C-alpha cells in the first residue's frame, strides 16, 4: 500500500514538473521577441532625443 | 559624448574620402552591371521552387 | 554496529521531508477528482449525440 502511496506521489510531481515545462514553452517564444522590441525602442528614443551628441 | 562625436567624425572622413573617387558614368555602368547579375541569381533562386512546385 | 540500525533511521527520516512535499503539493494541487467529474459531464453529452445520431 506504501508503495504505491509512493507511486502516486511521485506520478503528481511528475505531472507539475512538465506544467512548468509546458509554462517555460510558452514563456520562450515571445519573450524574446518583446526583448528585441524593446531594443528598437531604445534606438528609436536615442535617435529622437538630443541626449549626448 | 566624446566618443559619438570621435565616431562620427571618422565615419564623415571615410564617406567624404570614397566619395571624392566615385566617378559617376563608371560606377553608374558597373552598378547597371550588378544589378543584371544580382538579377539573374535572383531568377534562378525562383526557379529552384519553380522546380519543387512539379 | 549493523548499519541498517542506522540507515534505516536515515531514510525514515528523509520520508518525514517526502512526505511533508507531498502534504504541501496536494494541499495546492487537487485537480483530479474535478478532472474526472469533467470527464463524466463531457461523456454525457457525448453519449446523447451518440444516440442522436
Given at each position: 500500500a506504501q508503495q504505491r502511496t509512493m507511486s502516486e506521489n511521485l506520478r503528481r510531481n511528475l505531472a507539475?514538473?512538465?506544467?512548468?515545462?509546458?509554462?517555460a514553452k510558452t514563456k520562450k517564444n515571445m519573450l524574446q521577441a518583446r526583448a528585441k522590441?524593446?531594443?528598437?525602442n531604445a534606438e528609436l528614443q536615442q535617435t529622437l532625443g538630443g541626449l549626448g551628441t | 559624448?566624446?566618443?559619438d562625436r570621435l565616431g562620427r567624425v571618422v565615419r564623415a572622413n571615410l564617406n567624404d574620402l570614397v566619395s571624392k573617387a566615385e566617378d559617376p558614368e563608371?560606377?553608374?555602368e558597373q552598378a547597371v552591371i550588378d544589378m543584371q547579375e544580382?538579377?539573374?541569381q535572383l531568377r534562378q533562386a525562383v526557379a529552384r521552387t519553380i522546380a519543387e512546385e512539379k | 554496529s549493523s548499519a541498517t540500525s542506522a540507515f534505516e533511521?536515515?531514510?525514515n527520516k528523509?520520508?518525514?521531508?517526502e512526505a511533508t512535499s507531498q502534504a504541501a503539493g496536494e494541499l495546492a494541487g487537487f485537480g483530479i477528482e474535478n478532472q474526472f467529474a469533467q470527464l463524466e459531464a463531457s461523456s454525457g453529452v457525448e453519449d446523447e449525440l451518440a444516440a442522436l445520431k
Open positions: 507539475a514538473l512538465e506544467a512548468k515545462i509546458s509554462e522590441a524593446a531594443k528598437a | 559624448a566624446l566618443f563608371k560606377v553608374l544580382d538579377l539573374v | 533511521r536515515m531514510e528523509v520520508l518525514d521531508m
